[PDB]
Amino acid sequence: LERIKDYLLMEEEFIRNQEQKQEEERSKVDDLRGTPMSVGTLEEIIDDNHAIVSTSVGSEHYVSILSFVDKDLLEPGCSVLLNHKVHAVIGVLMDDTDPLVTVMKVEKAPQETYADIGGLDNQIQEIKESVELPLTHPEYYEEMGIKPPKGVILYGPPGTGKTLLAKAVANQTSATFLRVVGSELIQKYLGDGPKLVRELFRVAEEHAPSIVFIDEIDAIGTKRYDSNSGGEREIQRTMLELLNQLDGFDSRGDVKVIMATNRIETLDPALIRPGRIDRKIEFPLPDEKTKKRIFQIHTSRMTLADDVTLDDLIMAKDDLSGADIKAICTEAGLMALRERRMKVTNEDFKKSKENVLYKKQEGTPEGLYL
Amino acid sequence: DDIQQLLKKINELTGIKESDTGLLAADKQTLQSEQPLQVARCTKIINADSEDPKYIINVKQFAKFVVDLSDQVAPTDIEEGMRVGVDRNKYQIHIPLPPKIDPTVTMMQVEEKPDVTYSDVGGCKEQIEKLREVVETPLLHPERFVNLGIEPPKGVLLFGPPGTGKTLCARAVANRTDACFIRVIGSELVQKYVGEGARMVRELFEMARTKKACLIFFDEIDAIGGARFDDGAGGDNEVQRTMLELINQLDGFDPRGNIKVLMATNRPDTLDPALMRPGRLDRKIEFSLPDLEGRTHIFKIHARSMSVERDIRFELLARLCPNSTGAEIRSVCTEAGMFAIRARRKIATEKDFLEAVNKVIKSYAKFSATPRYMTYN
Amino acid sequence: IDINDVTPNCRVALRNDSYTLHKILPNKVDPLVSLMMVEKVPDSTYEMIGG
Amino acid sequence: RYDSRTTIFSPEGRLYQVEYAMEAIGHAGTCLGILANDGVLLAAERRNIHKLLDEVFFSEKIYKLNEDMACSVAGITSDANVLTNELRLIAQRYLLQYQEPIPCEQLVTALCDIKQAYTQFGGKRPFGVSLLYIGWDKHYGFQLYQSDPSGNYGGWKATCIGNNSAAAVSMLKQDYKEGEMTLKSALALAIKVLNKTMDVSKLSAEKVEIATLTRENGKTVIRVLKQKEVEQLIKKHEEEEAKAEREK
Amino acid sequence: PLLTLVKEIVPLLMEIEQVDMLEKDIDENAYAKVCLYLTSCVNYVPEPENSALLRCALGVFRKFSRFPEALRLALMLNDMELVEDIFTSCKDVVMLGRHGVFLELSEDVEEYEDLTEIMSNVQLNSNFLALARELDIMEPKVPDDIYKTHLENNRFGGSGSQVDSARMNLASSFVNGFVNQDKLLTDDGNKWLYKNKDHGMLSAAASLGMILLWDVDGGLTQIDKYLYSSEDYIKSGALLACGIVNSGVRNECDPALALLSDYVLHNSNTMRLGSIFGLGLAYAGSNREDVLTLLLPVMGDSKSSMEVAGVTALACGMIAVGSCNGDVTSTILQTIMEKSETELKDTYARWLPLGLGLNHLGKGEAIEAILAALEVVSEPFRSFANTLVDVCAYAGSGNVLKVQQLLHICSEHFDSKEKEEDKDKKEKKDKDKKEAPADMGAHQGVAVLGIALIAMGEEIGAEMALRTFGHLLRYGEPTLRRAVPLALALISVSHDADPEVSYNSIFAARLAAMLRQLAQYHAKKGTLTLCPYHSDRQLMSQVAVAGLLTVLVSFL
Numbered sequence A: 001l002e003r004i005k006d007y008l009l010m011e012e013e014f015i016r017n018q019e020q021k022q023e024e025e026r027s028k029v030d031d032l033r034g035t036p037m038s039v040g041t042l043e044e045i046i047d048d049n050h051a052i053v054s055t056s057v058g059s060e061h062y063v064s065i066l067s068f069v070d071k072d073l074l075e076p077g078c079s080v081l082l083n084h085k086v087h088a089v090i091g092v093l094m095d096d097t098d099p100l101v102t103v104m105k106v107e108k109a110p111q112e113t114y115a116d117i118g119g120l121d122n123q124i125q126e127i128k129e130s131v132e133l134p135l136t137h138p139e140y141y142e143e144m145g146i147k148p149p150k151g152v153i154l155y156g157p158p159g160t161g162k163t164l165l166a167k168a169v170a171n172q173t174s175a176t177f178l179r180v181v182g183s184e185l186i187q188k189y190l191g192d193g194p195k196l197v198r199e200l201f202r203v204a205e206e207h208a209p210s211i212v213f214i215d216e217i218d219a220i221g222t223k224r225y226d227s228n229s230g231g232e233r234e235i236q237r238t239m240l241e242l243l244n245q246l247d248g249f250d251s252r253g254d255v256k257v258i259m260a261t262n263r264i265e266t267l268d269p270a271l272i273r274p275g276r277i278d279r280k281i282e283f284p285l286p287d288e289k290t291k292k293r294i295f296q297i298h299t300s301r302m303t304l305a306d307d308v309t310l311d312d313l314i315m316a317k318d319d320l321s322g323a324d325i326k327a328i329c330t331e332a333g334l335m336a337l338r339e340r341r342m343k344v345t346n347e348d349f350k351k352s353k354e355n356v357l358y359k360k361q362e363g364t365p366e367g368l369y370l
Numbered sequence B: 001d002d003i004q005q006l007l008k009k010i011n012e013l014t015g016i017k018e019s020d021t022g023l024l025a026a027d028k029q030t031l032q033s034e035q036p037l038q039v040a041r042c043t044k045i046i047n048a049d050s051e052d053p054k055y056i057i058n059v060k061q062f063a064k065f066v067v068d069l070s071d072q073v074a075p076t077d078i079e080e081g082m083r084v085g086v087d088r089n090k091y092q093i094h095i096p097l098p099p100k101i102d103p104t105v106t107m108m109q110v111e112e113k114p115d116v117t118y119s120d121v122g123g124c125k126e127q128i129e130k131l132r133e134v135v136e137t138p139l140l141h142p143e144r145f146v147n148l149g150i151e152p153p154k155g156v157l158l159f160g161p162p163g164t165g166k167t168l169c170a171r172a173v174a175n176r177t178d179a180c181f182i183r184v185i186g187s188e189l190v191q192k193y194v195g196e197g198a199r200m201v202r203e204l205f206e207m208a209r210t211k212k213a214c215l216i217f218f219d220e221i222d223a224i225g226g227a228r229f230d231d232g233a234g235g236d237n238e239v240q241r242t243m244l245e246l247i248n249q250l251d252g253f254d255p256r257g258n259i260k261v262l263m264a265t266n267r268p269d270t271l272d273p274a275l276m277r278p279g280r281l282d283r284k285i286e287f288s289l290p291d292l293e294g295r296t297h298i299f300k301i302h303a304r305s306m307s308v309e310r311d312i313r314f315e316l317l318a319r320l321c322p323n324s325t326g327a328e329i330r331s332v333c334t335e336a337g338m339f340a341i342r343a344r345r346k347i348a349t350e351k352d353f354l355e356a357v358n359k360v361i362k363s364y365a366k367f368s369a370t371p372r373y374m375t376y377n
Numbered sequence C: 001i002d003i004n005d006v007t008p009n010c011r012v013a014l015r016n017d018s019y020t021l022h023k024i025l026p027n028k029v030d031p032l033v034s035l036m037m038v039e040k041v042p043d044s045t046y047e048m049i050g051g
Numbered sequence D: 001r002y003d004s005r006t007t008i009f010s011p012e013g014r015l016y017q018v019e020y021a022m023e024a025i026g027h028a029g030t031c032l033g034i035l036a037n038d039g040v041l042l043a044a045e046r047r048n049i050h051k052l053l054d055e056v057f058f059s060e061k062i063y064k065l066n067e068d069m070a071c072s073v074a075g076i077t078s079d080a081n082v083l084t085n086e087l088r089l090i091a092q093r094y095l096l097q098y099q100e101p102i103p104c105e106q107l108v109t110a111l112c113d114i115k116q117a118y119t120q121f122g123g124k125r126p127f128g129v130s131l132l133y134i135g136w137d138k139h140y141g142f143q144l145y146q147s148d149p150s151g152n153y154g155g156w157k158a159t160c161i162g163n164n165s166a167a168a169v170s171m172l173k174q175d176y177k178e179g180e181m182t183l184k185s186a187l188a189l190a191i192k193v194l195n196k197t198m199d200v201s202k203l204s205a206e207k208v209e210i211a212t213l214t215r216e217n218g219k220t221v222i223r224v225l226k227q228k229e230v231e232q233l234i235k236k237h238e239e240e241e242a243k244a245e246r247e248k
Numbered sequence E: 001p002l003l004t005l006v007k008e009i010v011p012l013l014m015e016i017e018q019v020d021m022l023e024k025d026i027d028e029n030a031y032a033k034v035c036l037y038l039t040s041c042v043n044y045v046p047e048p049e050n051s052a053l054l055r056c057a058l059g060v061f062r063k064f065s066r067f068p069e070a071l072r073l074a075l076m077l078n079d080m081e082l083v084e085d086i087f088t089s090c091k092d093v094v095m096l097g098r099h100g101v102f103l104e105l106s107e108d109v110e111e112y113e114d115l116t117e118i119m120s121n122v123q124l125n126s127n128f129l130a131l132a133r134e135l136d137i138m139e140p141k142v143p144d145d146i147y148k149t150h151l152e153n154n155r156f157g158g159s160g161s162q163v164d165s166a167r168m169n170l171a172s173s174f175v176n177g178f179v180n181q182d183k184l185l186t187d188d189g190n191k192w193l194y195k196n197k198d199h200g201m202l203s204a205a206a207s208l209g210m211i212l213l214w215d216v217d218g219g220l221t222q223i224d225k226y227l228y229s230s231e232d233y234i235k236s237g238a239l240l241a242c243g244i245v246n247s248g249v250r251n252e253c254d255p256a257l258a259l260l261s262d263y264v265l266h267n268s269n270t271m272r273l274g275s276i277f278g279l280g281l282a283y284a285g286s287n288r289e290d291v292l293t294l295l296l297p298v299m300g301d302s303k304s305s306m307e308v309a310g311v312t313a314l315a316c317g318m319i320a321v322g323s324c325n326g327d328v329t330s331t332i333l334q335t336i337m338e339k340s341e342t343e344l345k346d347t348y349a350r351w352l353p354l355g356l357g358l359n360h361l362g363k364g365e366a367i368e369a370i371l372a373a374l375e376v377v378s379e380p381f382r383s384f385a386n387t388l389v390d391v392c393a394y395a396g397s398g399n400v401l402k403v404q405q406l407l408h409i410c411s412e413h414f415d416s417k418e419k420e421e422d423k424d425k426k427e428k429k430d431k432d433k434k435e436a437p438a439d440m441g442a443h444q445g446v447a448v449l450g451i452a453l454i455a456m457g458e459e460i461g462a463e464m465a466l467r468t469f470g471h472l473l474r475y476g477e478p479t480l481r482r483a484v485p486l487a488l489a490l491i492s493v494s495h496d497a498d499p500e501v502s503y504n505s506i507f508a509a510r511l512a513a514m515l516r517q518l519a520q521y522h523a524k525k526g527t528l529t530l531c532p533y534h535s536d537r538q539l540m541s542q543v544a545v546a547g548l549l550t551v552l553v554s555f556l
């Protein structure tokens, strides 16, 4: 019953987050500012302090600025805040990014370090040198003269846990991690969707070191095929904007991109090129040694009988994925609970593998033929 | 559980700390004058009349307003076809308004210079030479063209396999252009409102016309509706109008005049026929996969920064790369350094590159690069 | 209403004159609410299912 | 993609047209055989039974190829007629040259080489017929064989090709006993396997065709059981099921 | 495997029972959860139960031999007699050589060379006598360092240059001295010490001691280089150099006190003040008396200027110091009398705990420290001194009660005595620093913010600490800006490039430049080495005091 202490820790943390004016100067600004303030674009700057401000209603009247903290921050395209009635610039421009971009930023990673992953050690080495190592020890890259690889693609069959490597990177990253699916750019309006790709990157540059994960990239960029029927996907325009951000004039500053696809052949050649994906990581279906580590990790936090033979299940059946191993472990526990045994027998594991692998039918008469 | 208790105790201590912690003349006289000061909404004049001027102005979406000039204004200063500010309460042009800058178009102009020399681009002397006389020599020395009475092409299309160097050359031209360089954001041209983007393209040319001799880089031309299926569904109708507006402004009824257009496309076939037609873009400078002399030069430029033994043979490494784009050759150099970092050797050796050459080309699923077939030797 | 109570993507009520936060209003959901189909739960059939 | 020509090889080294033909054999009447000590047997399902059809022809899926050999055909009807003729021709051609009945494995290898050739040459489609061979030869004794459209062949103590082959093979593997088949027991195994594989209820005599090859007095005596002989075997299987009742 | 054995831990009855039945498993249950119990005593379990575990762990380990692991419990126990019994077992089996060489660093504040003679009665190979004394701790360091790299003026290069402008000219030479293991700092330049002035001149002369961490004969060579120095600042630094010559000397230390030592405000007396800290560098703890007699008249003199008393307090905090729980040091006993003597002199209030608190450090329950604190209570500057002593007196273990007590007192709006309390929080916890993040932005105390950067304390080099210093790199207060580079230096012990470039850009003032040099000064867990952070509680010290503050040294 140590769970109560853990539950208390979670509740206390929420309370801490919940618990996270000048005598005359502030009161004067409070009087100056309207109870409702409307934020609008700045179109023109005039030295008299009366500067044209664009608004949804398009009233662009030159309006005086009296900002106590600072009025030197005014810039073209800045979103100024104006009084609802007078429309004068109230003060320092509002500085918040679009709401859809805010959702991507991730502050908490549920998984821990690379320890949960087993047998993808070569894959771990590549992700670390591209992502974790340059930040931890920048001097090595400068001495070599190499500029650190900034882009990685993880391509593998279903259930090889490409996402698990990404979750592990989130657990130990100085860089802010923005997690965006490739299928999250379906903006119906013409435009907007390519602009959203620009928005994600501008935020990444604002947060300085940043890691971008784009799971299921197949949806955003595939083939770059012609309009054909004339429906015109506009997705190709969205992919072209991403292609521009990764290496299309200017620079990407310090932003690293991790992308994951079940199928890499479909992805258009331009996106999967050096300069957009300098390093490519391949997740193969687990073999035998990799399977042993995964089977141990999944069964590490469960009751295990001496009778169970982990090696027998791994060697007898070949083709099961890392996810399939976890499913066998969950199914085996349920099989034991049916007999009301918390402890898991070897028999339970044998029954479990059969139930999980019933949808996987492969091969035709290619037996006698060769 | 005791260790978990220690963290819970730490959280409780933080909670106690938070609760225990709990237990310019502009804002002065100027505000009193500022609140009375009235507003003047911007509007655009279209006409003027004799005697009482009765200038009629469209606000921007409201109505044609027959507004008389304000008492404290000069009638000559107010002009037909001039932006003006009209007070709503007094219904008169209190002060004239300066012409709209249209900043988003101004933003696309490069302004800054990318720090890449033509020297860094390698293995494409012919492609560089073709760009030089449509971009630098006609502008820098127009006299030579005039002597033969030959006009410059005034248009260039860079097309090639991805990673060839088309954009790298373009940034190099920007470094030494000595004339306005206008990189165009393809997504910006597409806009929510119908033909709103087409209005921007007119502005793009207008800005180009105001500056004397400027080069406009339409990178990713495919983004700017570079196709004209124009099917009955007309899903791309708004973009198709934007593309046609670019084509007419580019050429026909007086063309660029002093504007040189550089357009770069990974897929040239997709581009619409009217844009491909010359006059709009006279030159067709296709970039090509580098030859062995080019492959050695790209390796040498990329590896000059890296610390390596002086005896390495780039010619062997380039030969081992049968058909490699410049980006892949750069990928070999960076990968070779990464192998040396893995073994912690500060100075890399020829072997490191060979391992990288296998990794960058053969290890990738090229299939042709990796040989299991005895077939040919 | 506390500032803490306010959250992103929450449908609050803005006062007619001063746009003040009058109250927090729930049911901030798109047409997918009809798809829930939780209401009018289907006729009980666990016994009616056969072999 | 890599279909059409038997000649094209898929990037995974797979001849799809040959594979498609081997899969196609499934849409055919069930044919099964048991090696049987002191005998050998071939059993087939007579599909497409109708009141008007005469069935005057002796047999329909069972064809003798020699004095001491026979085959059952499952596949495209026209291709079967072509192959049966060639198999009959090869058998007599060997007798003419060597004056001895062709060894059973050789007749099978020869047709299989012809079937194999069709796959290697562009112009023709791979044969859609698979067949089972029953015969006695002095060199290796009673034998049973299977041929595939791919041209591969094998010798099986028991095997099935048409319709639900996997169901018969699973039933045969458990029921069959090595060295104890004893012909009459093998006939019973066939009737029981046939009942399971055929969706037909009661396994009526018209639906089943049984051919048994035995060596009597030094001479092979291939015989196709008459309907009355087939009926008694069916009644015995039904009676055995009645004995199984209550105990099961 | 001891999973259900830990259940009987609460009854200590468990300690005696655990030794009674522990036989088959050399480690296993003895390690793991029982070792985790030792780790938990460091993490959550209270100090009195922790002391009982240390004896229990020693008892199980003694059956399994392995004297060095038993020694680690004994140093944590802080019981010299128990440690001596283990030393007799470690002397019995000769690894004994590693045990002694590591012992000089491993030994707690209980003894410095006292541990060297703890098992000396047998003497035998004379291991520990030389191994646990400064004789073997740094004798192979110079050859071992030579194999890895060659010491030189590389950090004096332009990338590592700390600039001049007088204030940073002294800092630049001292920063080069930190790189000095490396013995040419005085040789570098012509009269580099002459370029150094006042407090900086003391630092350059001190660099002779820094130049040789070990070697009495080499240090005498340093003494000849600046023998009978003409300027008082050179003379004071040379006496300090005699102190820094060795972790322990037994030779130069006796003359260093004898030289000068006027015992009243005077030139010779101020010149001796350097030697007083240098003799302090030799030892640490609470209750030793080997060289106490030499330093006894210095605090007894109680000169009105804090300079004699403060160096004497620093000296006593690290001179006559051995036993745990604090002690009645004859000078510390009269230090309280000197503290009672001065109603004013706020410098005394900060400096007196440098000795009293250091004695009260390396303590367990510290009830004796509380009794000394009752004598200390009086006027508010003395009350602040009492708080600083109490902060050092806190156990420094898993107990959160002491931390919560400082936290509640710190929350009070007046923080004059609570300035160092935030630093004390770090001293107590050395395991899971979940509570290490401090909501300094929520705190409105300028003083609280000033010590906030120091509150992170010494670190291996983790980036999280660097990020906090960078965020607070340019706070409005100069003191706030000054603290972040010293704190960055503590973590330093990019890797260092990002701080050097950022500090230079943000700085541009002389004040800003010097703090930046201090972070680059350190560009390239021991009970005895728990001395420098305590030695610089307030970076509020003026530039002359900061030059005196350069004396801090101990970590490898």
Ligand SMILES: Nc1ncnc2c1ncn2[C@@H]1O[C@H](COP(=O)(O)OP(=O)(O)OP(=O)(O)O)[C@@H](O)[C@H]1O
Binding pocket: A243, A247, A248, A249, A270, A275, B120, B121, B122, B123, B124, B160, B161, B162, B163, B164, B165, B166, B167, B168, B169, B264, B265, B266, B298, B301, B325, B326, B327, B330
């Ligand atoms: N000839 C070359 N010389 C030097 N670097 C080159 C060359 N070709 C390619 N590169 C390298 O490849 C990248 C330049 O790619 P660039 O900006 O030209 O876009 P691109 O990939 O050719 O364009 P697109 O994606 O539209 O096909 C840089 O990393 C650059 O160093």
